[PDB]
Each structure stands twice: as structure tokens, then as C-alpha cells.
Amino acid sequence: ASSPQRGRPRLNAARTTFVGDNGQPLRGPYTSTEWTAAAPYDQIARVKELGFNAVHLYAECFDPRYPAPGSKAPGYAVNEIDKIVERTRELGLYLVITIGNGANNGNHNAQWARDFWKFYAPRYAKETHVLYEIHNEPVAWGPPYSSSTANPPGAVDMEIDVYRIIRTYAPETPVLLFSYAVFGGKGGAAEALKDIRAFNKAVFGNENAVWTNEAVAFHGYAGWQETTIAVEELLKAGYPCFMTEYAGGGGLDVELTYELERLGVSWLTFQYIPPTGVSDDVTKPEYFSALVENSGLSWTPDYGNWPAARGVYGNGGLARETATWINNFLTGTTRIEAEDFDWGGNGVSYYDTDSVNVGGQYRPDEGVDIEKTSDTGGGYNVGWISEGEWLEYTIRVRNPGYYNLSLRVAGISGSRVQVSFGNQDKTGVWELPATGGFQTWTTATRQVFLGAGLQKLRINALSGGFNLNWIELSPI
Ligand SMILES: O[C@@H]1[C@@H](O)[C@@H](O)CO[C@H]1O
Ligand SMILES: O[C@@H]1[C@@H](O)[C@@H](O)CO[C@H]1O
Ligand SMILES: [Ca+2]
Ligand SMILES: [Ca+2]
Ligand SMILES: [Ca+2]
């Protein structure tokens, strides 16, 4: 290259999503040129510092009355869209361009959409960083668009016609199809498959076509659980997909983000690039960065060092899910070994006063001090604990409410800890019992009130003088 401009994103090896020119998912917030100036260069640039490598653009809002007299034709925002294209080009960002809806979400004007893409598909065909998303939420509110009673009918015909237009003028540009508002359950995937089959027959001559440069765009409005199921089922069917709009409503949907990361699916979140948008500002910590930081969510960003490289130790890299009760028994393990703190390093997933593990056991190349334990069950304990040290464990709380939090501890004298969950203090100062020896073990328990979701459990040592074997958490 002779600039930071990114190369064409392509379907990944696993055929789950589009990845960039380094094999990594596209991740990004949104902006709009539907009625405003292009977001300024400096604000677009900031997305790189938030771990993103892509921008979702709602380029123009369709006119429901087109082509009637006084209706607004596509192309009116060209000078603003050109600015977003150039800015993302120079910044080394991907750009996903779509048609927005304004007051008409779950609807479309077919002629307007065809005319939009006749203009814009050739215009950006040669911009390797740019992807085309046919039309935002064109049907109320999800699949099957191909049903005769879809509201409105005929959206698959629009998808087909627009696809033909795009591919005529922009033969190598990634195309994202459907943009389903509500994509949920095994049923949602099955209905989407009817749409896919119909589109495929019309465009490729075979209901079961293997896409080379297309994916299903979908939104998160079925909710994280049902959306995850629909995505899993579609992926099993052999069709890649791409998250193009979702929110926790109100801020990043941490749970859906986690699942998309797990599944290998690119995502565009519904928080905006300053100065303006119709939802929440992605640069305000409370709607994005704090949610990421508190949850323990991590990915490898294209630029910078945020989010920090980190993850769960053991448990197959999955967040440790809390157990529940059925009648009088526990459905899964409640015990998190102290020595199984998140990887990431000193100042990231733990803080240790010395970079060496002086105990030399279990994780000899990290800074936490670990020795063999003679407590019931064997294994290891964290030792050489001093004031200001801390340890983090990424967990996933299944249900909100009261939990018994237990620490398995040993100490010659008294000691003090405090425990945070998602960077919220749940214990205050917790005085720990002197047991009279560093391998004389007791279980200390305090009741805590937890919110549901992915969250870091952080143990803060307010003093030294204790060893820690394990942590247990169970609903009351
Ligand atoms: O379709 C709209 C678009 O016009 C913009 O307001 C972003 O939100 C979407 O729901
Ligand atoms: O944690 C203690 C450490 O402080 C040192 O006293 C050696 O024994 C360990 O168990
Ligand atoms: Ca150490
Ligand atoms: Ca230590
Ligand atoms: Ca242990």
C-alpha cells in the first residue's frame, strides 16, 4: 500500500462473517449523513482508541413518497458521504454504507433503493475499505420477507434487484443482505433460510448457493439470548452473518457482544460517533468503554492497546457461569480456584508487587505467587499476598439477586479484603479470621447482591497476611 487504506474484507475461513485484511472481525459504532454534516475527522479518529476498526454509516434516509413531485431523490448527501469515505480511508477503518429509514423503520421504497445503489454502487466500487448493506430494516420486523403477508411484501425482490445493480457496478464489494430488525430463535433462522433460498434461486440459480462475498446483516432486537440462537442455527446452515445494529436497551449489549465474539461474528453497535446521533454517544464511558472494562470483555483491536489483551484462565476460555439451584442441589460448580485468575498480566488482570511468582507453582511465568496447598482437595493457593495486590476473575452471573460469597483462607494473624463485581464494591471492608497458620484453612462467607451478566470479580487485598485457596459463589 501507500496509505493506511484497508484491503477488501472477505469471508473468513470458517465462513461465519466478514473479516478484514488481517483476519480480524469488523467492530465499530455508527454515524449518519442522513441530514447532518459528516462526523469530523477528529471524532472518527477516536474510534481507533476505543478498539474499533469499522464505522456503520446510515448514509441517506429513503423518501416514502418517491418519485412523486416534491420527493427527495437519492444522492442528496453525496458530499457528506464522500467525506466519510475519505476519512475512513485515511484512518485505516472499514466503512459499511446503508440506507436508513427515519420514521419508516420496517419499511422501504423499492424504487428509491434501486436509484440509491445505481448512483452509489459505482461511486465507491474501487474503495477497498467499503462494504454495502442493501437497506436498513426494510420489513416490520424480521423474516420471512418472502411471505405474501410480510409487512410490507416484496422485500426479497428489492434485495435481488439491488444485488444485481450492485454487482454490475461493484463486482468485488462485500454485500450485506436483509438487515433483519428482529432475528431470534431456531424459528428466526428457519424463516431467514426461506428468504435466502428465494434470493439464491433468483440470483445464483440454486437455492443452496455457497456465498463467496455476501453475508446476512441482522440486528439485536430479538434480545441477546434469542439472537444468539438464531445466529448459531444460521451458521450451522452454512450462511455467514454480520451484526449491523444492536444496543442494550441504551449502551453496549455486553451479553450479545460476548456471544458474537465467541461465534466469530463482526458487529456494529448502535452508539454514535460525536457530535450527534439518535441513540447514545459511544465515547461516553457509561455507554461503551466502562461496560467493556467492568465486564471483562476483550478482543484484539487493530489499533492501540485497548481493550487490554486478557481472558479467562481455564474453563475453555469461557466466562465462569454461576450455578443455580434445582430443588436442593446445585447445577454446576460454584468454586473458582484462586490460582485461576484471568490472564492479561500485571496491572491488567492482577496486580502483584513483584513480577516473579516466588512460589514457582502452576503459572510460573506470571507475577502471582502460587504454592501447593495441603487444604482439602489439594492443588494450589495464592500466597505472598500484600497490601494493594488484587486478582480478577471473569464470571457470568446467571440471575440477579443475593449470593453467598465464600473465600477459603488461611492466616497467622488478621487480614482484610474487599471484593468488587463489575467495579462495584459488594462487600465493603471484610475482616478475615486469623486461623493461626498459613495452611490452617477456614471458609469466610458474606452475602452480596449481584446484577446479572458478564462481570469481573476482583479481590482487593487491603492487608497482607493471608493465603487464598478458592472462591465460591452460590445463590441464597
Ligand atoms: O432508520 C433509522 C435511521 O434513519 C437513523 O435514525 C438511525 O436509526 C435507524 O433506526
Ligand atoms: O503466603 C505465605 C508467605 O507470605 C510466606 O510466609 C511463605 O508462606 C506462604 O504461605
Ligand atoms: Ca510475585
Ligand atoms: Ca504477591
Ligand atoms: Ca486452589
CATH number at residue 139: 3.20.20.80
Distance (angstroms) between ligand 4 centre and the Cα of 435 equals: 20
Residue with CA closest to ligand 1 atom 1: 101
> Is residue 73 included in any domain, yes or no?
yes
Q: How far is CA 46 from the centre of its chain?
A: 18
Question: Is residue 144 located within the same domain as residue 253?
Answer: yes
> Is residue 198 included in any domain, yes or no?
yes
Distance CA 440, CA 413 (A): 11
Q: Which run of H or E residues covers position 341? A: none
Residue type, 282: V
Question: Is residue 136 located within the same domain as residue 249?
Answer: yes
How many structural domains comprise the chain?
2
Of 373, 438, 440, the residue with max ligand 2 atoms within 8 A of its CB, to mutate for a pocket test, comes to 438
- 13, 16, 90, 114 alpha-carbon torsion, rounded to 10°: 120
CATH number at residue 352: 2.60.120.260
User: Are 453 and 252 in contact, with CB atoms under 8 Å apart?
Assistant: no
Question: Is residue 280 located within the same domain as residue 343?
Answer: no
SS3 371: strand
Distance CA 465, CA 340 (A): 20
Residue type, 389: E
Which residue shows C-alpha cell 489439594? 378
Distance CA 3, CA 405 (A): 53
Distance (angstroms) between ligand 5 centre and the Cα of 402 equals: 24
All three cell numbers of 390, joined, read 488484587
Closest atom of ligand 2 relative to the 369 alpha carbon: 1
Q: Spell out where 206-330 has E strands.
A: 214-219, 241-245, 267-272, 280-281, 320-321, 325-326, 329-330
* Distance spanning both ends of the chain, measured CA to CA: 59
Question: Is residue 342 located within the same domain as residue 280?
Answer: no
> Is residue 316 included in any domain, yes or no?
no
- In terms of residue numbers, what domain contains 429? 332-476
Residue after which a domain boundary falls, among 270, 292, 307: 307
> Is residue 313 included in any domain, yes or no?
no
Q: If phi over 0 gives left and psi between -120 and 50 gives alpha, with beta otherwise, what is residue 345?
A: left
Which residue shows C-alpha cell 420496517? 106
Method used experimentally: X-ray
Q: Which run of H or E residues covers position 120? A: helix 110-123
All three cell numbers of 232, joined, read 448459531
User: Are 471 and 406 in contact, with CB atoms under 8 Å apart?
Assistant: yes
Question: What are the b/e assignments for 279-315, b being 16+ CB within 10 Å?
Answer: bbbbbeeebbbebbbbbbbbbebbbeeebeebbbbee
> Is residue 30 included in any domain, yes or no?
yes
CA of 389, nearest ligand number: 4
Around ligand 1, the residues with Cβ closer than 6 Å are 32, 34, 58, 61, 100-102, 105, 136, 278
Question: Is residue 296 located within the same domain as residue 364?
Answer: no
Residue after which a domain boundary falls, among 307, 322, 357: 307
Question: Is residue 361 located within the same domain as residue 237?
Answer: no
Of 31, 32, 135, the residue with max ligand 1 atoms within 8 A of its CB, to mutate for a pocket test, comes to 32
Closest atom of ligand 1 relative to the 278 alpha carbon: 6
103 exposure class (CB count in 10 Å sphere: 0-12, 13-18, 19+): exposed
Question: Is residue 172 located within the same domain as residue 205?
Answer: yes
CA of 383, nearest ligand number: 2
Q: Residue 345, Cβ neighbours under 10 Å: how many?
A: 16
* β pairing state of 401-411 and 437-450: antiparallel
Question: Is residue 294 located within the same domain as residue 424?
Answer: no
- What is the DSSP code (8-state) at residue 15? S
Which residues fall inside 5 Å of ion ligand 3, going by CB?
352, 354, 367, 369
Of 34, 55, 97, 141, the residue with max ligand 1 atoms within 8 A of its CB, to mutate for a pocket test, comes to 34
> Is residue 325 included in any domain, yes or no?
no
Question: Is residue 290 located within the same domain as residue 362?
Answer: no
Question: Is residue 199 located within the same domain as residue 340?
Answer: no
Question: Is residue 303 located within the same domain as residue 367?
Answer: no
Closest atom of ligand 2 relative to the 410 alpha carbon: 10
SS3 260: helix
Around ligand 2, the residues with Cβ closer than 6 Å are 371, 383-384, 438, 467
SS3 426: coil
SS3 468: strand
User: Phi, psi (5° rounding) for residue 426?
Assistant: -105, -10
Of 357, 371, 408, the residue with max ligand 2 atoms within 8 A of its CB, to mutate for a pocket test, comes to 371
- Reference 171, options 201, 112, 200, 128; nearest CA is 128
| For residue 153, cis peptide bond before it (omega within 30 degrees of 0) | no
CA of 366, nearest ligand number: 3
> Is residue 281 included in any domain, yes or no?
yes
Closest atom of ligand 2 relative to the 464 alpha carbon: 4
> Is residue 327 included in any domain, yes or no?
no
Question: Is residue 385 located within the same domain as residue 282?
Answer: no
Q: Residue 330, Cβ neighbours under 10 Å: how many?
A: 12
